[model samples]
Target chain A: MRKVIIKENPSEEEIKELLDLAEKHGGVVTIFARCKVHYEGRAKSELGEGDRIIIIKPDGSFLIHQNKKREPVNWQPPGSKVTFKENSMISIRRRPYERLEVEIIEPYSLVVFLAEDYEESEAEMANLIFENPRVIEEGFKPIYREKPIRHGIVDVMGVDKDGNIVVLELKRRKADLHAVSQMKRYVDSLKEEYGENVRGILVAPSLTEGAKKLLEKEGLEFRKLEPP
Target chain B: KVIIKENPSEEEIKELLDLAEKHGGVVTIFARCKVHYEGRAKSELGEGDRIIIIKPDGSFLIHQNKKREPVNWQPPGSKVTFKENSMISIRRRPYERLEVEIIEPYSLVVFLAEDYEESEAEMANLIFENPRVIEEGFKPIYREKPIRHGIVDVMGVDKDGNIVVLELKRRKADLHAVSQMKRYVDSLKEEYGENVRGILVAPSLTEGAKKLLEKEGLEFRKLEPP
Candidate 1:
């Protein structure tokens, strides 16, 4: 269960409680209020005399959104350090090359919700094949995903339209040289047992030039799979 | 007077009160209603239990619980008309027309409140946001550091422990930026005696910018605007 506190023009202690709540549960806190914002470092932008939605994400990123426009009026990406003063909060970003400061004024109606881990797990990529086989190649049908072989687990063990066994190697990023060699080994092992009807296909958003050349040398085919 | 009503009687003159009483305000009503909005695009929301907000200066909004965006809305300064228990709001500008109609509103509540005003401010800050330059130790050791030609964006030691003069551009850098960096490098060399360096930062470089940099003892770094 999540705890919630709603107050009109909350006090300094209440705001501290809310920040403490976010820290404890790894949640976001949103405040909608009329306020002034001043930005420094990188470039200066000020959003003055209006209502803005200020969001502080669990990872320390913060955004100030105006009543209009989907993009934030001003923001500090995650990895910022937040400091508080009486009636104010300042977000500081210090990197090897730059520094930034953001101040939000007179926020209200703060709401916080626990955040979820956003990384794409390998399981999710393999699951996409089951939902839409056509994402990799047309006329493709999924056999059983994660079929275990002696070397390792096959991401997608399937069949192409031509009735050949397809062994898919999935990568969410650029499939590099190492990935192609790994898939080649998997396919070669399958070929020894299943005979010449086995095909190894490298599936990824893109491939490095070296990876592509190695793919050709390894006798593997390629299919482009974009991230969702 | 501000009237707060939960669900007003059907016999009440709802339309008259919606338009007659206030100019700067907000009103909330709950009902099973179908809302249609036609403006930048056309959308029709079917009959459902929802809340309606009418703002001062004749702006209307419809909301369903658990959704942040309004189901439908007419921008402020629209002409609102009430008929029976239903309402129609329309606004016209030079290039377009916005129309919103609400049917079978189950209740009506009105409020008179002060209007919200908005303003903007602008200024300049030197830190670069994307493909960041500041994070790499291009700290402004001396800002607007003086040289013969003009000001350098920053003059500081880089991550690798070298005195570097930095020239920057918000967009793709061209030859002019390269030449500017060369001038800063030349001036700094005179003072620091050959150990001073120059680095150009931008989203990209012209083909010639690279060649010029290669020969000038300067380097190029890429930074994208945030």
Candidate 2:
């Protein structure tokens, strides 16, 4: 990925979009380290190469670079894995930006991509947001009690349309399901506070497949995700 | 308000989210692709109509209508190899400049045996499974035996109605495989009045040997591996 100098900054929304592309395309991204482990990530990865790279963080800052000249090109068919020829093409290219460019072509049809810089599997999280339009329209604000449950901060919280506060336990990649009981505390708390149908959503791409399977039939939507 | 579609590629997601931010919607969902094993079946019939038959499960995909009563299909592989003399020309062939023929009966009288043709059964198996391709269902059949004085692979029709052709290249043979295929194709049309429907499966196609085999104003039909 091209490391463009950050000449200026961008708003929260733009940052979210940029990070969405960046994470998926394997571009370099960054975030500011705030108090303790609480670093504002929105400011991370300021360089958007005008491609699929999007930079987003908890902070209100972000950037987006859209490559207007480059149209999508493909030497392979849809539903095809990288063959010797395709991989060879991948190897000869020196630029990481070009590498991401080639990989994006793999999403032949409607493909959803994620990045490490977005909120939580930012793309998946955005998908959830997209599916629940009414809830967002109703001003169902994201209450405090955010990640790490770092003693004082909010463990996790979200407003579902049914007036039920969904318990979301967000984390970076490499999070474990053992945190289930930890997140369960948030679910139990939300249930007691609002007497609503509180559920747990473990938002981390690092969760193992085996660890996620058990939760599948149990009503929890296991999103193994990266940032964005 | 913002709405993002599920399974949006990195670019799509980026674009949609931008439009959403520029507009409105909410919630996001992510779904991906996965493959699974279905089932399998055993056909007592000779043509093996079913393509992929999974073990344990009994589901099957019959590619073609199986003739009633499980009977061995004539023409071992249901392959037609024309002697290049008399073949049908009903309607302009799908592709002009191409000859297609189903190889007729193999009487040990004319054609010589391939290496190690021990017995009639062995020879029959060798001829039926020429080039020894391992596939799930009926693959396009190509005539392994080369015809004399031709610069191309001959096109023939199989029971499945697919055109098949073989362009053999020996290790020491610097034969212009591509140029040769072009001539073989030319001969098929002028002599037998067959379509250009062909799959030139050669041992080695020269860089220039790439046959852009096309049929009646259609895109080039690429010769490929099974």
Candidate 3:
């Protein structure tokens, strides 16, 4: 495919002819001429009087005019230098099985947000809270990332073995006293609507002294992850 | 139907965090993209030690609904660590403004750039020690009506200010990556100074990417293994 940007106005027929020719030669043409541009995977040509013209070989660079002998000159594209392979991202989440399990959390409002930040640890922790999306009749259900009602969207959240709702809040830096109040409000609201079925579990690399003391109060639980 | 998600119990959160540590914590990218995706598949990770997903796009609630948050972070005993492969999918994510992380909280941080990075891989390249990476971008050079939302991959003093934009892409790297990178360069120049150059960098160079890089006379580096 080629990308051609036109500065001045050109006719539609001229472009159609160019598109047809490029297509016949197994090439794709994509022209971004103006508001109404031609879109495709081919090539095209039109008459122009050296109006700041450039010939770009598909790879993305252009041919340089070695020495200006305008009458007798040749344009050469650079040769392909290296080869590479492509890999796809699969859907399964599994660990090497030799890591430590320091924290457990239920899938709730926070997991989804932290997961998107590319925080692998938070995801790993999220995965542990619930089992994979297996098709078995019973056992732990698959966890999902989500936007929170009280907080914002976040990474991992899951159902614990005990059936209580768990929420995981992950931060690039340390968690603060705010996480407690934040989770506290969410839990209270959830309990009001769903009875005592909701719970809040927040974790971060570290916690503020004030945040840690609050977690000691009954009905709230969390872990402070140290740096690796 | 907006089914109010029945909140899980606190015990559930504790269990999940425990599960996360068991598998390096909630920092894996794979866990999010493939919701309920089971079986053996590929991974959205590299560098392996620790992972930090890029800050996602969308509002607070919007981001949550999409489950776009990142997980897991620095681990214990990591004197210094690298949170590799922060995805560059924006219209203008500049250099020196990269989101970085070390396994431990060393109070270490910095905003890296080409002209900067004082000495080799030593986090603190040029100026201050453990300087914090800037949260937002620098104010655009020339004031325009309503600044457009932009993102670029790299920002450095290209060869001469004449052509200051530098962008790179691996063979399989998306073509839009270069396009967006260039947009950032142009924006930089438009906002900074006219002399600012636009460049590109490709590890496993692509044909289309190369042509664009050269056509603009932008600077580029052929990919080399570190």
Winning candidate number (DockQ)? 1
Expressed as tens digits, the lDDT of each residue in B1-226 for candidate 1 is: 2343334454464642644353543455555555544344333454555555555555565545333345565665665555433343353542122222334444444434333354001001434322144445554465555454345666677666667777766656667568757867886777778888887867689888998999887887765555
User: Top model by TM-score, which number?
Assistant: 1
lDDT by residue (tens digit), candidate 2, B40-154: 2111112111111111111111111111111111111111112321111111222111111112211000101011111212322433465334222434343333322232222
* Per-model root-mean-square deviation over C-alphas: 23.9, 28.6, 25.8
Which stretch of 10 consecutive residues in model 1 chain A shows the poorest summed lDDT?
Answer: A95-104
Ten residues in a row with the worst lDDT in model 1 chain B? B119-128
**Model 3 CA lDDT for position B130:** 16
Model 1 lDDT per residue over A94-118, tens place: 5422223233345545555443442
lDDT of 3 by residue, B1-226 (tens): 0001122233432343334334331221211121110012112232222212211110000011112122222112221112221212111211111222122211111101011011111211210121122111212122111112242333333223343333333334344446655655666667776676554444455677667767765555443323
lDDT of 2 by residue, A68-159 (tens): 11111111111111111211111112121111112121211111122122211344554554454333345444554433221112334666
Interface DockQ per candidate:
0.03, 0.01, 0.02
Question: By TM-score, how accurate is candidate 2?
Answer: 0.19
Please give the RMSD of candidate 1 to the true structure: 23.9
Ranking, lDDT, top scorer first = 1, 3, 2
| lDDT, residue B86, model 1 | 39
Could you arrange the candidates by TM-score from highest to lowest? 1, 3, 2
lDDT of 3 at A216: 80
Give the local distance difference test score of model 1.
0.59
Q: In order, what fnat does every candidate score?
A: 0.03, 0.00, 0.00
